Amino acid sequence: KEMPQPKTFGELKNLPLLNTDKPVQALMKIADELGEIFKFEAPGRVTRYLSSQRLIKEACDESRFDKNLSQALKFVRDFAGDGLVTSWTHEKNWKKAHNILLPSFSQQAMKGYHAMMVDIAVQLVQKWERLNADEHIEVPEDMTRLTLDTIGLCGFNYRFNSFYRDQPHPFITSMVRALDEVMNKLQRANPDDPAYDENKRQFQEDIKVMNDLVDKIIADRKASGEQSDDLLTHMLNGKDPETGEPLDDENIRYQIITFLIAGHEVTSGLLSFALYFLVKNPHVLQKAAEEAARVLVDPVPSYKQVKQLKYVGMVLNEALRLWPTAPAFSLYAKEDTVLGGEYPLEKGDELMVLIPQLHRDKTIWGDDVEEFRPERFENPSAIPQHAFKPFGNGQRACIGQQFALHEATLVLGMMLKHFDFEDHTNYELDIKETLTLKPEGFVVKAKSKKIPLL
Numbered sequence: 001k002e003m004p005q006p007k008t009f010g011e012l013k014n015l016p017l018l019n020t021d022k023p024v025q026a027l028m029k030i031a032d033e034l035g036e037i038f039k040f041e042a043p044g045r046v047t048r049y050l051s052s053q054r055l056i057k058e059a060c061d062e063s064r065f066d067k068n069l070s071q072a073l074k075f076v077r078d079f080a081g082d083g084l085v086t087s088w089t090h091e092k093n094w095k096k097a098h099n100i101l102l103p104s105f106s107q108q109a110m111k112g113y114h115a116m117m118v119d120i121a122v123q124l125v126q127k128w129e130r131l132n133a134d135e136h137i138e139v140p141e142d143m144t145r146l147t148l149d150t151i152g153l154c155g156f157n158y159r160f161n162s163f164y165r166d167q168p169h170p171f172i173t174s175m176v177r178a179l180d181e182v183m184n185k186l187q188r189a190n191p192d193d194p195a196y197d198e199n200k201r202q203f204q205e206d207i208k209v210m211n212d213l214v215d216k217i218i219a220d221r222k223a224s225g226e227q228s229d230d231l232l233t234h235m236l237n238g239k240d241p242e243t244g245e246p247l248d249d250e251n252i253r254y255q256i257i258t259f260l261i262a263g264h265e266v267t268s269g270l271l272s273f274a275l276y277f278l279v280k281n282p283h284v285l286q287k288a289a290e291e292a293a294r295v296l297v298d299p300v301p302s303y304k305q306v307k308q309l310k311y312v313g314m315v316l317n318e319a320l321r322l323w324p325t326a327p328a329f330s331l332y333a334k335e336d337t338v339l340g341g342e343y344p345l346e347k348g349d350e351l352m353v354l355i356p357q358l359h360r361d362k363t364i365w366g367d368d369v370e371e372f373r374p375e376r377f378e379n380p381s382a383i384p385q386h387a388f389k390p391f392g393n394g395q396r397a398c399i400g401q402q403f404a405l406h407e408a409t410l411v412l413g414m415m416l417k418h419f420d421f422e423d424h425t426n427y428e429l430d431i432k433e434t435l436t437l438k439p440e441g442f443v444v445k446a447k448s449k450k451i452p453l454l
């Protein structure tokens with residue numbers, strides 16, 4: 001079968017289709033029009049966007065396909081280096097860092113991070129308790145304050161103190177501006193035009209800021225000798241069982257940069273979309289709030305109580321279904337192979353997995369695919385293989401999944417325990433795209449139930 005291809009622009013092929021404010025949503029509309037697979041070409045590049053569980057279940061076979069760096073991840077590698085997300089599977093530092101960090105990211109490790117997550121969650125709740133009557137909440141903004149502070153504290157015992165400020169931390173200014181340059185660079189029809197020389201000088205300056213600040217975090221910790229129970233201590237002290245080697249300081253810096261990207265708007269986006277869907281679905285909100293009140297019987301949640309917030313967990317999975325905040329990942333064929341009995345691929349051929357569109361496969365989810373129904377996730381065994389991929393696939397899946405879900409379940413549970421929510425503007429969903437997704441301008445009012453944290 002010859003696969004379809006969206007409209008072309010002469011020698012720029014399909015590249016101008018990406019020169020839009022909302023490229024993921026544009027690719028979703030192309031998939032609506034063209035179906036489960038389409039070819040996408042740009043100067044020097046061919047890939048194939050997959051959208052059906054039928055084809056993606058094959059693409060997730062690690063004997064046939066391995067992780068590819070998309071152009072986006074190749075550009076992120078200019079500042080995240082051979083950290084875990086921007087490493088190829090065959091680089092020594094991927095498997096080394098993977099083996100060392102897996103124990104730091106397990107459910108067991110979450111028991112140790114729990115108290116630091118609570119510290120930040122209580123700050124969020126106190127901020128909202130302290131708002132004046134008729135004041136509102138800027139939801140993505142506050143969710144990013146919470147997720148950034150949580151990965152700073154659990155990551156390297158650093159307080160970004162995001163609830164004390166409006167202006168971002170200098171590291172975050174350079175990180176966000178670096179990610180903006182990545183997005184801009186993907187959209188340039190003529191990337192070598194001297195009109196972008198200033199952008200490139202700024203990008204290099206931002207790389208240096210991130211390196212300098214993280215290198216000093218690492219140097220300061222080695223100099224103090226402090227043994228806090230954070231990711232940095234584990235990286236300084238751990239040895240890979242396979243090679244017997246530790247990570248060196250440059251790779252530790254790249255991992256820290258990698259975690260800060262991941263724990264910033266990628267994770268806060270999940271909380272923002274979850275709260276959006278809850279306020280647009282009042283019966284779902286009521287059920288989740290009933291669970292929070294039943295389970296969260298103490299002034300601060302315990303680790304075991306967060307594990308008991310089963311419906312809150314289903315709410316988060318259903319938000320990941322509709323708007324997964326890391327919306328694509330890339331693969332390449334390890335050898336010649338045929339996809340779906342119809343599409344022959346050659347060794348090295350690239351695939352993109354378009355996750356929001358996979359999650360809209362009606363052959364899997366049924367006709368009500370746009371509805372927000374957390375009960376879809378009552379039983380993971382009832383979900384077909386590779387139908388639900390917000391955290392990627394296989395050995396290259398998200399190492400932070402348990403971390404992101406624990407922090408999100410904890411704070412959403414506390415939010416639902418402590419406040420009633422009003423969609424006071426009847427907010428119209430507007431999804432802003434960076435390399436992640438967020439409901440731009442999403443605001444609510446939160447009326448306290450006046451339940452103390454003491």
Ligand code: HEM
Pocket residue numbers: 067073084085098151258259260262263266267270324325326328329330389390391392393395396397398399400401403404
């Ligand atoms: C809801 C929040 C998150 C989502 C949806 C998410 C999604 C993903 C996805 C889709 C991938 C695979 C990317 C690819 O194949 O190119 C990935 C990888 C990864 N994520 Fe996350 N992520 C989240 C939060 C986090 C957090 C909080 C951390 C750590 C602080 C983290 C650390 C990583 C790492 C290190 C990898 C690379 C794993 C490897 O290849 O060995 N992620 N994430």
Ligand SMILES: O=C(CCCCn1ccnc1)N[C@@H](Cc1ccccc1)C(=O)O
Pocket residue numbers: 018023024070071072073076085183186187261266326327328329352434435436
């Ligand atoms: O595949 C990725 C990268 C997703 C990586 C997730 N991530 C990692 C760190 N922060 C976020 N983008 C997509 C969509 C896209 C297209 C053009 C411009 C921007 C985005 C693509 O190129 O098709």
